[model samples]
Target chain A: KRRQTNIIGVYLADYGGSFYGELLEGIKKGLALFDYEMIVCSGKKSHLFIPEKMVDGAIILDWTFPTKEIEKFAERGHSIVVLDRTTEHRNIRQVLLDNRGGATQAIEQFVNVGSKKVLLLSGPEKGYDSQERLAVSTRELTRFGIPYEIIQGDFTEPSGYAAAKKILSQPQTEPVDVFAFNDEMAIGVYKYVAETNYQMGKDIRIIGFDNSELGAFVQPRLATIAYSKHRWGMVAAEKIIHLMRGEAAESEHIYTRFIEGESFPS
Target chain B: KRRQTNIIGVYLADYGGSFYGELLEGIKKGLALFDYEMIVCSGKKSHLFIPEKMVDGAIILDWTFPTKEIEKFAERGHSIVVLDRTTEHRNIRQVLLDNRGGATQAIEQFVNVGSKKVLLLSGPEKGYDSQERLAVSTRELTRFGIPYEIIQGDFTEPSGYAAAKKILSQPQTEPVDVFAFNDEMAIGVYKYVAETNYQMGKDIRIIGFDNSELGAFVQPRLATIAYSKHRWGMVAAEKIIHLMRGEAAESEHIYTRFIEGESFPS
Candidate 1:
């Protein structure tokens, strides 16, 4: 057996965008308290590093890590913390965001503002966060008897821009409320707004999730769901640390809040 | 001797924020074309991953990898692509941004706008890009007989915000043109502007480097120096691959352009 080091491994599908910034900072803070080394792994082959015992335990945010594989590792006595999905294992813990709650808040805000027509800019088909948000938002909107359209997006700025472009090209006599699943796509929505006569706040009221830093600077600001990505990472780190210490670890859910902005006009 | 695998390593001091997103995307695209694997390393002990024949060659943007260590690696025939600084090792190549040229363009724009007073928010002291930008901008402004003050910044939004807060606290009669070394810090300045009676485009015209995506969404938009971070990474990957293949690799400099926006109104 390979010697287990004090290193904690973090797995992501890829390392890109502003989304992971605060989360990594939080992870760093949590690890600092215990003097543990951190090794971030992304891409396909990074899984090989974990099986080699390069790290003592793992924190997973990548959907590429299937449930079976994680369970297999856990069964072999590998401690793990998963951020994207729910699982019940003695050696595995979870730290998930309240995606359903956030989506409900966004839908409720749109209904309260008297929006008759709405658009849903959905994230990738495989993303756990996207799936949860889409399910809850759809249920909430349906309950309110609201008419809406769905555009498939990959949770990227370009996809959001293209979706908005597709919408703008079509005939639309009424202003529509748009709920982009994440802030990156919302920025794309804003990009489309910048190039045309269409105004974001008035012509197309927009709301995004994640409350990324870019949301604060956008014209009229972006109304979105806010949560501490940092806290999520911190909790995951702490949980993994506890698991590594052979202590019983509990799953944690980080809650979310709605931040109103000029885009929704309060 | 260890068998050389087709894995290309990328080193960073840390992995967080919007800065590395497009660059990594570009690298991924380039590496995919050549069917090369990529391994990203960060922090101190990550150095061990390099010397153990874990990767074929490396692309370094990390300041933590000291000049002496890089030189030592080159002496041992390790191929490297230095993205952050200039070097002339036979086994090493460079892919650097045109920071000096970009800074000159920014200063010339400020002069063209007839700004009498200017302020600079600089990045970290040890950052090659920051040092080059600061040196060139200062020289160009001095040549134009424009006087300016500078506040050290760490290329983070909070640092930019704190710098702006310090400036705002001091009584100033004239509106000053501000140059934040990078877009992250410029976003910080926007944060400070959003909370106060101070207007971003009107009260304080601003310019930044890197032209990060957030710069585009800022209200009035942030005027910035633009470069292809993607291209920089692509070319770096190509060059390192050439070195690994025993082909003569030439150093490359990715150029920059000025993106005019409402932030620096004419």
Candidate 2:
């Protein structure tokens, strides 16, 4: 068995959640151009079956694996493209978003906003994007001598709304500044803010990560940290194909930016 | 080799098109609860390989098939659940949407509004959803002694905007009514109208199909026909599993409703 199945397996533990569809869309386009087939491995257990028999390589959404379990696939000689994770295997290549960079840029904005104190609307505790961004923001804020508090969110709009609602329950003297881990949560803050006397950009300085299109449509537009998920998928697919073909494939980064908007208090 | 791979294939021809994410999201939940694996077959050629080698049954997004080619899979003894199309084979079950009823309810609103003439923001020439809905609206309007004109759009918001812009340039007698094939197009018309003297609900009335959440968020909420694409997929999955288990699964319909909104002229 030469093990050239002409199929690439995508391990999507959270296949139906959040932004997987757009990622899969780009991966589909990339695979098709090179005549490779795509088989979506759903559920965590599905990947176990893919390593040897089904596909030539695997592209794992970061949510799909812990570092060691992913290393096992590479140890078994299966080529892999792991998103948002790192390893020291020749069989693995990574396509990572600039989560840390985006976070630094985000917190840096609030640091310079002369923020008295900041509130963090966080992503899931274990989520790589959330953890990396939150960690960097904590470091940046601490370095800038700004105190901060955390309000939990799982990167959903409702979570952001509830978090902001909790924050708004206590009246404060100075304007409140919030750093939402992602745009959906930031928009949620917008929803809660709209019902009160607090005019966005006047009373609340909010910044979000993942500059989703929703950010631009909201009134006073959401100020968010940005990167293209579609481009991340495209880059992952290309690296996976290269890994499969025994070519020199290197890890790539989808860069980021601080998209300025009226959500930020002047 | 008893063909019990515990996997089901989903053929998505226009995999990245509108409403597919929600549909796939529902299908993934349905499949996972039953402990079945999913392999998304992207291109049409990929389906040819799936008939015998990959999966036990297939769920075809109606856009993926044309009755005849789908028949080829049925002949090979692979069970199928087809969306928005009918079938006679025991191997195939259909999950059809109520396009006709939705179309009727939409056009009925315009006729009752005393619309002298209507403009149809038609879908692609061969699209089943557009074709079926447009066909019924023409018949309903004709019966009511109302004349109409067609403005072509590809069911995209930009196309709808361009179509509406072209319509607004010319003058007409009574308040012009528009029946957009989908809500995105209707919103597009809203965009073009916002820049002109034509105020929606006073100068022009409009209706859209597919009650996308966007329809609700826009100013003066868009009246649209509603059906859950997620519900459509859940039913499709249930039917496919029943067919595979050799049980009594009948073809099902995801029903429609005309959600009322102020977009209609008072």
Candidate 3:
């Protein structure tokens, strides 16, 4: 059988976890116009199922494959498009958000309001976002002479709750005036506060990333980073399609915005 | 250009609208494992940019396609997997719910609670759900010799609101008992009734289909047909992949259950 030439390969992460599925839908819609045959592959993660000899190109979802795996795909000469942030790879095109800039702006806004001893709740330890935001916070705080501490928490509510609880029990008498990062975890912190002497925007100013709708229902809305996953997905699809056709695109830097929510004080 | 071998045409309705995007995502994931390449096309309302020539087969999403279009895809010698409905085409396999059985069970449960004068807000005007539910409800009511009315409403919330408003404003104002439907529209009916003199449980009872999260959040949790769209998507994807690979599968029907909620009074 003669192998088809215009066939495209897509690497999707786990089903129903995040919003990457919507991005793949947009890509499928876009590729239909050009009469390209696309085959989408999924495994436990992004790196497991890229066959040794199939597909002309690949579209990577938000999962982070090790640098070695990315190198292997590149060495195999498969045109690759990474949707979210991964460490930069030569000849591997990507579409990613301005996570560092957005995170910095979020932290700076809290600091500008005379808040000292800020706390950061982070994403997964191995996640690119957690690494980037942590790095930016470290760098920017030193430059601006702002006092802060990174209290690690994964992006889940349970993790956020545990992290905040640990902080509350500490013997050191540092009152954390600004809380940041981990959108799901922020809700846990808010829940704990609701039953206590603390009140949002008064006892402590809270800020979060990923402006999910759940944040809107809290007594005072949680301020977060407004990154457009829809646009993020569209560009990821477009860049890959372009790379497959031997075309070049603009820079890989995608955009993000700072979302001001009700939880922040005037 | 050499025509590629085994290039399949993938078709769906607006992926932007239905919760069915997850189904398409599953299919794409399955397709990634195989050698075949898929050329996907979609329509705004059933028939739009389906290709003219060179499609080996199609996976159809839209149910309201003209019979001639079905015939054309069939006549063209393409292996078709219709997610439309089963029994419509004996040869072509379909992914459909057990609507009649599910509807009958849901209605029977409400009847067991001594509900009388049941009002059903049906699904889409000419949809597979609307037709089957209407038949089953009428037949079940006759067996019990119960009086009922089929108020017109599409599957969405707004239509349900309008239908409930109309029912509440009726001139012969006997206290309303049971309200049921094939979709989440009955959830909207609850809100509309609140605006009137009667309160839920004491005066009005309501139930809906599609076990959505809203059913759980409402004051009296509304009863609904419990089915997993996630599982439905996985099966549909598997069926289409089987169709593409010239493989046969058993089971055309997906399981549905009557999940009892707090909407009906004890």
TM-score versus the correct structure, for each prediction? 0.83, 0.73, 0.56
| Chain A superposition TM-score, candidate 2 | 0.85
- Candidate 3 error regions (>4 Å): A5-18, A35-46, A51-55, A86-91, A171-182, A188-204, A217-219, B1-266
Error of 2 at B30 (Å): 5.9
lDDT of 1 at B34: 91
- Candidate 3: DockQ? 0.07
Chain A of candidate 3 gets a TM-score of 0.79
Which predicted model would earn the best lDDT? 1
How well is each residue in A3-69 modelled by candidate 2, as lDDT tens digits?
6777787776542234565677688788878988776645434443444555678888746467777
Candidate 3 per-residue lDDT, tens place, A50-139, comes to 443445666665344565777788766677777645645655786766878887888777667766566777766676767888888777
In model 2, state the lDDT of residue B258: 88
Lowest lDDT 10-residue stretch of candidate 1 chain A: A45-54
Worst 10-residue lDDT window for candidate 2 chain B reads B42-51
Better of 1 and 2 by lDDT: 1
TM-score of chain A of each: 0.93, 0.85, 0.79
Best by DockQ: 1
lDDT of 2: 0.77
lDDT of each: 0.82, 0.77, 0.63
Candidate 2 clashes between residue pairs 3 or more apart in a chain or in different chains: none
